[PDB]
Ligand binder design. Structure first.
Ligand SMILES: [Mg+2]
Ligand SMILES: [Mg+2]
Ligand SMILES: [Mg+2]
Ligand SMILES: [Mg+2]
Ligand SMILES: [Mg+2]
Ligand SMILES: [Zn+2]
Lengths: 135, 38, 130, 93, 135
RNA sequence: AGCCAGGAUGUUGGCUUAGAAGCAGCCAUCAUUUAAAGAAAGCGUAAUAGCUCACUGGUCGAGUCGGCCUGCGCGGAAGA
């Protein structure tokens, strides 16, 4: 009830321009959002949009979902890139490996709906080949 | 209603039907699609 | 929808009614992908690949996946009844996991038709070692 | 390995051939070897449905003519000029 | 457009157009456009149908133009009396009999060949049908 | 054909405007975690929400679907 799957980068909290009222348009304001957003951003390593998923009941108290950041941006910090490459099969920018993707996706056991390791591996390699890093 | 001399289905919702001896295309969604062979 | 795939799924269903003593009524009417997601996530988490949320629930493909055993389980064919089999234990609590899958916010049309597991009464039997 | 039923055609010319093509039965010939050629006529339905699949122009055919089977091979076909129709078929024994 | 770069004689007879065609079989490609009617194509109509079918298949796979205009058709001007010589040579036609395969195509699906030859057949004066290769 | 139904993770693909979520398209383009599952096929979406559908089961109980050769017709068809 009353949820969204959308977040901007967790290096900034109380993010009123990019998402903002996407989390606190309603009667719930953004003060517990920014406080506990920093409190959950301290857990997962930085440089990542660490997304929050809101629930609510008729008492204005709840416990959100603290999910892992996208593997898109885990590959971003893995390759040092933020704006990777426009038109991802024209210019050459790099190539990544299954072991490094295992090192990135070893901790996603409570976020991924996949009980296959090589599925996550070649799926994030396809993410890389859509990124610009043709494996 | 565009009174074409060759009616032709333009989506999936369009249905070709025959009133009065002429052909018509009647559409449920888009009223631009409605045609008549005249 | 295709003949040899229907025959090989008949072969898979008679091999798996050979395998599992836990054949279970899963009776969805409004079958949710997230109940399928937990039923497949726990399948991959505490099994290998053998477990599914299999729907081969045809009115006369159940009756010809039958004739290994349970030859009075053809009337459990029609009227929206589904089958899920799983091996280890005499009707292990993954039966109750699929039952909680058919009971999580669902439309109340599960009713546990029975599958003739112990040749016992029609009611729910949760008598297990645990 | 197809079995086509033929019939021995009596008279040959422009006229009887066009009359056969009107009456749905295109003519054909069987030559080959030292024996004489033979003047057969076939239905059009069966042989167009056979020559659709491309094993007809490939393998050994078999013609039931007068009861007696003839092993034969399709050689050279004249089609219609502007239609999906057959005109004549050269067969080699 | 499509004209012979050199000819023996400038102006040719009219001539009739009777008899059946020759190029009935689809020799080169795989999918051909067979003219079932009888008439004269021109250089304008051949270039129009070729650029239409090139737009249709989006320049993938080979096109074949089989008939080429080489018979000049002349036109006397306006406000000119009937005498005083055969008129000036204006444009070039190509005679088509029933059965002539005009365009061929390969390196395309069958259905895309159907759509392309429909799109180019609606810019030609003679009624045409579709045809495929046989063995 | 109706009819009771259900219908993604990687991810919300890199981008680059502004938020990139199906819609802003290019370039990608698969492993299922597989009842069936679309990096969703469209729509107007301020991205925010979805509607469906692709497919699968229920129900129902005799044919149904789309191409070719055709015969006769239909529209195209307005003038003192
Ligand atoms: Mg009226
Ligand atoms: Mg009109
Ligand atoms: Mg004569
Ligand atoms: Mg002459
Ligand atoms: Mg000639
Ligand atoms: Zn319409």
């Amino acid at each position: 009830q009353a949820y969204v799957k959308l977040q901007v980068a967790a290096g900034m909290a109380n993010p009123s321009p990019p998402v903002g009222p996407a989390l606190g348009q309603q009667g719930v304001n953004i003060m517990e959002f920014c406080k506990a957003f920093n409190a959950k951003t301290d857990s997962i390593e930085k440089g990542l949009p660490i997304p929050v998923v809101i629930t609510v009941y008729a008492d204005r108290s709840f416990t959100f979902v603290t999910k892992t950041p996208p593997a898109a941006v885990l590959l971003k910090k893995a390759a040092g890139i933020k704006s990777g490459s426009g038109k991802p099969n024209k210019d050459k920018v790099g190539k990544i490996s299954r072991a490094q993707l295992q090192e990135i996706a070893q901790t996603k056991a409570a976020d991924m709906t996949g009980a296959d390791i090589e599925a996550m591996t070649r799926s994030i390699e396809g993410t890389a080949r859509s990124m610009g890093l043709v494996v | 209603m565009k009174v074409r001399a060759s009616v032709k289905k333009l989506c999936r919702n369009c249905k070709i039907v025959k009133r009065d001896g002429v052909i018509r295309v009647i559409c449920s969604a888009e009223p631009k699609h409605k045609q008549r062979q005249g | 929808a295709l003949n040899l795939q229907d025959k090989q799924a008949i072969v898979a269903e008679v091999s798996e009614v050979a395998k599992g003593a836990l054949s279970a009524v899963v009776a969805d009417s409004r079958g949710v992908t997230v109940d399928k997601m937990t039923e497949l996530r726990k399948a991959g988490r505490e099994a290998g690949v053998y477990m599914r949320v299999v729907r081969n629930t045809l009115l006369r493909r159940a009756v010809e996946g039958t004739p290994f055993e349970c030859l009075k389980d053809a009337f459990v064919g029609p009227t929206l009844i589904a089958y899920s089999m799983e091996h280890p234990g005499a009707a292990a609590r993954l039966f109750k996991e699929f039952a909680k899958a058919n009971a999580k916010f669902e439309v109340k049309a599960a009713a546990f038709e029975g599958e003739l597991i112990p040749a016992s009464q029609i009611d729910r039997l949760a008598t297990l070692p645990t | 390995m197809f079995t086509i039923n033929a019939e021995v055609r009596k008279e040959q010319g422009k006229g009887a051939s066009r009359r056969l093509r009107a009456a749905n039965k295109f003519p054909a010939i069987i030559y080959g070897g030292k024996e004489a050629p033979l003047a057969i006529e076939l239905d059009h339905d069966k042989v167009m449905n056979m020559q659709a699949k491309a094993e007809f122009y490939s393998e050994v055919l078999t013609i039931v003519v007068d009861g007696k089977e003839i092993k034969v091979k399709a050689q050279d076909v004249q089609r219609h000029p502007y239609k999906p129709k057959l005109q004549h078929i050269d067969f080699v024994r | 457009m499509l004209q012979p770069k050199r000819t023996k004689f400038r102006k040719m007879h009219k001539g009739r157009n009777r008899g059946l065609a020759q190029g009935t079989d689809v020799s080169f490609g795989s999918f051909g456009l067979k003219a079932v009617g009888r008439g004269r194509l021109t250089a304008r109509q051949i270039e129009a149908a070729r650029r239409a079918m090139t737009r249709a298949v989006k320049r993938q796979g080979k096109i074949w133009i089989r008939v080429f205009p080489d018979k000049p058709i002349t036109e006397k001007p306006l406000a000119v009396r009937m005498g005083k010589g055969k008129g000036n040579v204006e444009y070039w036609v190509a005679l088509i009999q029933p059965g002539k395969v005009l365009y061929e195509m390969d390196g395309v699906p069958e259905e895309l060949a159907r759509e392309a030859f429909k799109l180019a057949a609606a810019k030609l004066p003679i009624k045409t049908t579709f045809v495929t290769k046989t063995v």
